[PDB]
């Protein structure tokens, strides 16, 4: 078979599947090493997605597989890798996710898994349709709760009638003043003005 290598990814995966059928395991992983040195970041991905799913399935030692993702990295790869890190350092994984809307949504989820406090923090990263998500995080942020409320104003003003219902709800929640509320509706009206002014 190797005589072919001296001189076709389907052929490669097939051959590795042969050794897998013989359960040479590690030898098979080597083949994926020999393929990827050839085809570069295009075809190599076509090899690499199955190679990852399989090799992670095998040994399931940190440093070797960690390095393997490192080699690998040069989108889904981040997700496999992150899935690995959480269950075999965690913050390190969070740093990796930190390192597109769906991707932002994920990180926030894993950060929530590490506890609540980060998630409000995550949105600030998030801001830089996304405003709907920053609103989605800010909603339970100040909503369960000053910089965050003022941020809610900054976001509501960032770019909407449901949001008006939101600010009206925040005003109604107080047992915080008609003046600030009318000023708020005035500012949103000014946003209606800047919006209508747009061509």
């Amino acid at each position: 078979y190797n005589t072919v290598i001296d001189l076709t990814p389907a052929m490669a995966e097939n051959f590795a599947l042969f050794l897998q059928n013989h359960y040479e395991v590690m030898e098979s992983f080597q083949v994926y090493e020999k393929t990827i040195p050839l085809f570069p970041p295009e075809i190599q991905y076509e090899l690499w997605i199955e190679y990852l799913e399989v090799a992670t399935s095998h040994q399931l030692s940190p440093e070797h597989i960690r390095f393997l993702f490192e080699k690998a990295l040069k989108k889904t790869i981040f997700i496999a890798y992150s899935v690995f890190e959480e269950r075999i350092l965690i913050s390190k994984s969070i740093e990796i996710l930190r390192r597109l809307q769906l991707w932002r949504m994920c990180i926030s989820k894993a950060e929530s898994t590490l506890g609540p406090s980060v998630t409000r923090e995550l949105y600030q990263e998030c801001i830089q349709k996304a405003v709907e998500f920053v609103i989605k995080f800010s909603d339970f942020e100040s909503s369960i709760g000053r910089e965050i409320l003022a941020y809610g104003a900054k976001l509501l003003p960032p770019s909407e009638l449901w949001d008006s219902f939101e600010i009206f709800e925040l005003k109604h929640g107080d047992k915080t003043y008609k003046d600030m509320l009318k000023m708020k509706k005035v500012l949103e009206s000014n946003m209606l003005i800047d919006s209508a002014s747009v061509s």
């Binding site: 030692s61 440093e63 070797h64 960690r66 390095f67």
Partner: protein, 147 residues
């Protein structure tokens, strides 16, 4: 040279490349030199003037002009191509002078992997410590005190 290619003169084109690299001690001057031959085929030319490259590089290397990464790419390229030439003792022999001169039956499977793991250059603190995780796992699975 892009002229002489529009003639035959495969003799004289070498004469050019001589004047060229000798008057331009630069990496891709040599690399153009060899990529030429690998286009027009002569292996005993190719290897020999690979030698003429590496003996001057290492020879007057002290003279400071050639940066590390230059020397590197000559190493990886020319040695790598020696592996393509089926002299592996010679490949890793060349490699051996490099690292020297510079700052049931699956036993050799581990020895070839562990040598290549250590052979991977590591500039810095975390890069060398990352390699320490690789070769230690290779040593663990397979002078135990000196390692």
């Amino acid at each position: 040279v892009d002229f002489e290619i529009r003639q035959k003169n495969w003799n004289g084109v070498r004469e050019i490349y001589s004047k060229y690299v000798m008057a331009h001690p630069q990496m891709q001057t040599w690399l153009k030199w060899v990529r030429f031959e690998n286009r027009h085929g002569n292996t005993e030319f190719t290897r020999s003037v690979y030698s003429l490259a590496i003996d001057t590089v290492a020879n007057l290397q002290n003279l400071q002009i050639w940066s590390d990464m230059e020397v590197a790419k000559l190493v990886n390229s020319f040695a790598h191509w020696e592996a393509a030439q089926q002299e592996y003792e010679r490949s890793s022999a060349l490699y051996q002078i490099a690292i020297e001169k510079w700052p049931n039956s699956i036993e050799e499977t581990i020895s070839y992997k562990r040598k290549m793991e250590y052979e991977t250059i590591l500039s810095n603190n975390a890069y060398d410590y990352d390699t320490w995780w690789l070769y230690l796992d290779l040593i663990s699975e397979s002078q135990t005190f000196e390692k």
